[PDB]
Design a protein around this ligand. Sequence first.
Ligand SMILES: OC[C@H]1CN[C@H](O)[C@@H](O[C@@H]2O[C@H](CO)[C@@H](O)[C@H](O)[C@H]2O)[C@@H]1O
Length: 273
Amino acid sequence: GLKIGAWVGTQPSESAIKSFQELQGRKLDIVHQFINWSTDFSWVRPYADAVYNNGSILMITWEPWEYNTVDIKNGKADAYITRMAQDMKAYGKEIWLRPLHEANGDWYPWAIGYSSRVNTNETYIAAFRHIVDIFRANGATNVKWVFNVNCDNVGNGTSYLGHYPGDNYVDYTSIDGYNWGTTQSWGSQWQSFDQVFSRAYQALASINKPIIIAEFASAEIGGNKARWITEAYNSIRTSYNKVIAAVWFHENKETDWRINSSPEALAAYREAI
Ligand SMILES: OC[C@H]1CN[C@H](O)[C@@H](O[C@@H]2O[C@H](CO)[C@@H](O)[C@H](O)[C@H]2O)[C@@H]1O
C-alpha cells in the first residue's frame, strides 16, 4: 500500500505527530523534518524517538545552507558529516535522508541553477557520493538515500538527471511539486497533480528505483482543492505506479498548503488517504 507521510508544519514532537494523525484520521507512515548542516544528531534524537515510538519512518531533508557542493566535495564538511554518520549508525533505526534537494531549481545555494554558478553536475555528484561514502565507512547502512528533483527545472543548467549520482548511491528517487493556483504575482495558474508531476515522473521512471512524492500540496485559490486532493491520490494509485509514498507539505506558508486550509479540503484528504 501507498505510504502516507507529512511535514506537519512544525518539528515532529510526539504531540505534533499525534495531532496530525487526529487531523488526517490515519497513522502517518512517514514523518518528515527539515534540518540544516549545523544541527547534530543530538538535536534530532528526541524527534526521531517520537517518530519511531509511533511506528513511523523519519525522513530528514538535510539542507546544507552552511556548505555548498564545492565545500562538500573538497571535504570541508567532513567532520560534521562523519559525526552525523556515527550518530545515525549508533541510533540504528531506518532513516530516509534527503540531502541537497531540489538541485534542479535556482533557490538553494547548493543547487545547479543557483545564481553564482558554483554548483555543477560534477560538483553535485561528487558531493552526494562523498556524503554516502562517509556514511558507509561508518557502517550507517540503516540510512536510505533519497535523490530529489523539483517538478520543474528552474534556472540555467538545470535538468532532471544531470545531477543524478548513480544507482549505487541512491535508494529512492523523489519529486517535489505544488499546485500554486492563482496565488502568485509571478502569474501562477491552477495545475492538476498530473500537470505538476508528469514530466518529472517520466524522467525518473527511466531509473530502476522506487519513487517518493517527497513534498506536495495544493492552494485553495483558483480551483477546488478538495477535488484536487481526491484526484491526486487517485492519480498516484492509478498511473504513478512506481510511487511508493506520498508526503504532503502541511504548512501555511507561501500559500495555505495545509490539509485543513478548508473543511472541504480536510474531508477530501481524510477520504483520499
Ligand atoms: O515553495 C514551497 C516549498 C518547496 N520545497 C521546499 O523544500 C520548501 O522549503 C523548505 O520548507 C521547510 C519547511 O518550511 C523549511 O524548513 C526549509 O528550510 C525550506 O527549504 C518550500 O517551502
